[PDB]
């Protein structure tokens, strides 16, 4: 497939509903060998199941809080005790705490649910970038991330994720913009809203599942299997001419305001 | 390839540097069967010479100034005597008066260079959209045009093309916002500097070429192979979640404000 | 008032509801001298008596159908025998047949319906700044326009007019590009739904009035005394730092995607 | 003048050079009434002779660090002893390490750096927002912030800043959308680049200036005078219209990619 010979650092998968699992899937089909990270020990066993599904193995599935630099750092030097280098990193998580996404705003947001959500949603991708680098060098490869409208304009409840949003859809054109000369690209996929484990704890996504919805041009919701077949794209050599790029798998509901 | 199985329209091939060549190639490699239009017998000959070379033939190659109904209208009628339906159009196509498009905004921009932009620029994808409308339902196909940072933000000779390329941007979106109900999806890719017949009749073009190279983070020109394998997966079932977008291939320049010190 | 000592040409007032109405009576309130177009004989009388309430009189009101070049450049000859320059105009103008407004976008529109709603919405904007060149030259002042979020963004029936007024809000930054080296600087005001003349046209403004109202952060809609004092606020020397720019007067809708719970 | 009975308080003044003395300057001649923070006791008593000539006074200049969130309450207490009622927040600070303005953006940028750049540039901004909201309440007033273009595009050096940046124009947009029923308008001017304190701490400042002076469709770079007459216009009822917008003050700089 148009992966084959890719090598892929997967950071996110949760469940099967996740984003994460769609991209795996996806780079899997694709010809892309995999290893994966978990968030903690109760994730652990779902991501080493999942990942001996997906042509990959348990000893190619590595402890990573990215809340943690040290755990980061650990993540490719164990990695690079099986692989002689590293393609891609795909940075498909993002937290705050619940408090900063129940009610208004200007209410509820605090310094520390803020510092929070962009350390975890927004930072960690630069610190993936960073780690990885020394893996990367020479491969010309590529990063991606997940990003979602909420970073452009707002919606209930969504509040300080979009901030932080917003501060990651920046991450990626800085970082395209430092790592390009050495022939490394990044890229985002802002995708429409999913049904996922993270997306139930958003006490008001079914309203932001129907609008998409009824608004979208495609009158549908997207898929985390259409989301993966747009990753996997911008992380292969077919996509060698894109680099800074949000890429939108919302059907089109970024282009409408028919509010 | 991940284009098996479909069938496309491509318009605005005129030589082996046009994007609509990098396009038709890429989509050739991963499966496409291929139709095309040549803007007038200046371009016939060479048109259908590629055409034979991308899996194609002469009697699939069909006259279209898109300038008229009439001429747009014919080519789905004479095309719809040899394929059922159809899954893809791809227009690749821009024009305005030279003149337009050298010197000073103001003092050279007319009426007459405005409405000539925007009919065969922006108007014509349109056009396209109607014409091929019944040969296109049901088949969840899509429709990809081209367009040029030009749109969202200025640099010198550009002028009214890039009126008429913001003009073109929002089409993609009211077609995307008519269309996908029925199954059509519509994109655009922005492909960055690229030396085409069009590139070179625009002057200080070399300068907008050297002027990406040095501050695209890629540090490099796009190719029309990269427009190409782009705008193949656009108009991929890969892609069947994506509609309505402007994809820029120009290695990252639009993301850029000043280049490195 | 921080207008007085400037004079500006304002293009656009057909009733009292008008934004161009909103304008003019921003503009004279802030002590500009002002004069006036009407598109044809049939806007004259209410232009005449509306201009005599904002200081100025039927002598500076001029006919002028922006779809005429002769008569666009006859207005400042004919200008320029009462004023000897001119700091500002104001093009508060647009129109597309109304068949195009009315259904599916890609069914309703065509090649000609583009062609006049591109023509006198976005062109009109160009042939005043470069007609008005020579009266503004050394002064030092600003074009306005009038644009809407249907140029970015998609909703029903605004279909052609959001491809013109995409065309349009480049042409503001092409115009800034060209003009601003010799002094002029150009701007826009996207305006929220307001009820006037040209939206009672448009079916289902009602519905695009409701939603505003709903959905944007002052949770009202926005009057032609916001977008006029916006409007003069730009042409004035406290905004000498601004070119180029679409500034948004409509509540903040234009940055929710979606509405309170 | 248009700001006659308007009542503001400006944080970020620190020299005569500072967009918010420029912003200051022009609200005092539209008529307001002005209040001040000042970050530390090395600025404090510049800001309270600063304060003298804008028909203010030392009790009306408070110590703020926007690090501290009870420094911040604490300005409000205070204000509040001397004024019924607020109408206008202009927040004009920022803030990041040096270490993270110089270099490549992946090498030199740091979660610590991270932090401090999105704490102190755009959650400062909420808290202000919060903590003045009572004072504010029922007065239809309006939240002025400062961005830069670098929140969009990118160019060397300005790094996790325009992380920072992209984070707090989304707060403009997420604040604008909570207080917005209650009648407060948010607002942000972004300005082109301007020799400031702060300025002079990023290497490359001058490629910059140089860069907006000759691409700029005004082909000349703005002053304070300029971004105060804009600030002071959003701050006003004659902009009562208009919320969550980015209003750039940059000559038109934004709008071009050769220029
Ligand atoms: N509607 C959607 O689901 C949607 C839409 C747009 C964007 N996104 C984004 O997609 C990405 C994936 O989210 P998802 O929807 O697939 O939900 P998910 O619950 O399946 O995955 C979220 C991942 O984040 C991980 N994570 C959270 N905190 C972590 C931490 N400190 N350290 C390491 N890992 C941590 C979780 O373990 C989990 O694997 C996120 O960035 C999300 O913001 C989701
Ligand atoms: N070359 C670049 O750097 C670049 C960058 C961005 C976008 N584009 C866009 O790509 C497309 C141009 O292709 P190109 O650069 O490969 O140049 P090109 O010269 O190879 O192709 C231009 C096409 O436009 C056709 N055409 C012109 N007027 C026509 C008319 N009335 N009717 C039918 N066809 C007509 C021409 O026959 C030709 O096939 C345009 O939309 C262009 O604006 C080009
Ligand atoms: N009303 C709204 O909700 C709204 C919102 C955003 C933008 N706008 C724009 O504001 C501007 C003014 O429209 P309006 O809402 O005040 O309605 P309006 O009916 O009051 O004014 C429209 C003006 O366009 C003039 N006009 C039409 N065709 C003309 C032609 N060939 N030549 C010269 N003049 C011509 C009309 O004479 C009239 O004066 C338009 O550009 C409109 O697109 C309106
Ligand atoms: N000068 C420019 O070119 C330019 C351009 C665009 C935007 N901006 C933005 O405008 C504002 C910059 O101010 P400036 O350029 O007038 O420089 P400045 O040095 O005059 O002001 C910076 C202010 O930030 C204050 N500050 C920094 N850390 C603080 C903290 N922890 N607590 C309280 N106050 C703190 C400083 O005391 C100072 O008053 C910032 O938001 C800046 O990012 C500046
Ligand atoms: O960003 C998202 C956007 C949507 Cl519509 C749905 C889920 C998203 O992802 C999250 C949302 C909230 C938290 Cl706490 C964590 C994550 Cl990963
Ligand atoms: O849009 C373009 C942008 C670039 Cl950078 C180069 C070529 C382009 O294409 C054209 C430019 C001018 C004319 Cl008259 C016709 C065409 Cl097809
Ligand atoms: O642009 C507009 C946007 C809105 Cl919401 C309302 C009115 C508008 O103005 C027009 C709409 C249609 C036509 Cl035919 C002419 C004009 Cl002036
Ligand atoms: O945001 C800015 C943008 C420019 Cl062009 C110049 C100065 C700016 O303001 C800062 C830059 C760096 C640091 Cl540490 C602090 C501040 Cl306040």
Redesign the interface.
């Given at each position: 497939g148009?992966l084959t010979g890719k090598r892929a650092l997967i950071v996110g998968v949760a469940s099967k509903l996740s984003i994460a699992s769609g991209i795996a899937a996806a780079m899997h089909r694709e010809g892309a060998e995999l290893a994966f990270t978990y968030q903690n020990d109760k994730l652990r066993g779902r991501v080493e199941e999942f990942a001996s599904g997906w042509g990959s193995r348990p000893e190619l599935c590595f402890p990573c809080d990215v809340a943690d630099?040290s755990q980061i750092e650990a993540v490719f030097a164990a990695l690079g005790k099986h692989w002689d280098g590293l393609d891609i990193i795909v940075h498909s998580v993002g937290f705050a705490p619940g408090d900063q996404l129940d009610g208004?705003?200007?209410?509820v947001?605090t310094?520390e649910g803020?510092?929070i959500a962009?350390?975890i949603s927004?930072?960690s991708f630069?610190?993936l970038?960073?780690a990885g680098?020394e893996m990367m060098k020479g491969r010309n490869g590529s990063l991606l991330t997940l990003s979602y409208?909420?970073?452009?304009?707002?919606?209930?409840?969504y509040?300080?994720m979009?901030?932080?949003?917003?501060?990651?859809?920046?991450?990626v054109?800085?970082?395209?913009?430092?790592?390009?000369?050495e022939?490394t690209?990044v890229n985002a996929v802002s995708a429409?809203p999913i049904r996922t484990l993270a997306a139930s704890g958003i006490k008001?996504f079914r309203?932001?599942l129907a609008?998409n919805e009824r608004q979208?041009?495609?009158?549908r919701n997207?898929?985390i299997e259409?989301?993966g077949?747009?990753g996997?794209?911008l992380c292969s050599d077919?996509?060698?001419?894109?680099?800074?790029?949000i890429?939108?798998?919302?059907?089109?509901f970024?282009?409408?305001?028919?509010?």
């Amino acid at each position: 497939g148009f992966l084959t010979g890719k090598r892929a650092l997967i950071v996110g998968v949760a469940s099967k509903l996740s984003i994460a699992s769609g991209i795996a899937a996806a780079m899997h089909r694709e010809g892309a060998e995999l290893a994966f990270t978990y968030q903690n020990d109760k994730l652990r066993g779902r991501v080493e199941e999942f990942a001996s599904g997906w042509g990959s193995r348990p000893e190619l599935c590595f402890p990573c809080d990215v809340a943690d630099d040290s755990q980061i750092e650990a993540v490719f030097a164990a990695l690079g005790k099986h692989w002689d280098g590293l393609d891609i990193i795909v940075h498909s998580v993002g937290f705050a705490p619940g408090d900063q996404l129940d009610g208004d705003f200007t209410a509820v947001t605090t310094r520390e649910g803020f510092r929070i959500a962009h350390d975890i949603s927004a930072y960690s991708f630069i610190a993936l970038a960073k780690a990885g680098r020394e893996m990367m060098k020479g491969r010309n490869g590529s990063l991606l991330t997940l990003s979602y409208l909420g970073a452009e304009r707002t919606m209930p409840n969504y509040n300080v994720m979009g901030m932080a949003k917003a501060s990651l859809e920046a991450g990626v054109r800085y970082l395209a913009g430092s790592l390009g000369a050495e022939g490394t690209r990044v890229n985002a996929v802002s995708a429409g809203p999913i049904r996922t484990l993270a997306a139930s704890g958003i006490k008001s996504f079914r309203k932001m599942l129907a609008a998409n919805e009824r608004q979208t041009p495609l009158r549908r919701n997207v898929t985390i299997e259409e989301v993966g077949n747009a990753g996997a794209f911008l992380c292969s050599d077919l996509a060698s001419g894109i680099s800074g790029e949000i890429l939108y798998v919302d059907g089109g509901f970024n282009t409408t305001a028919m509010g």
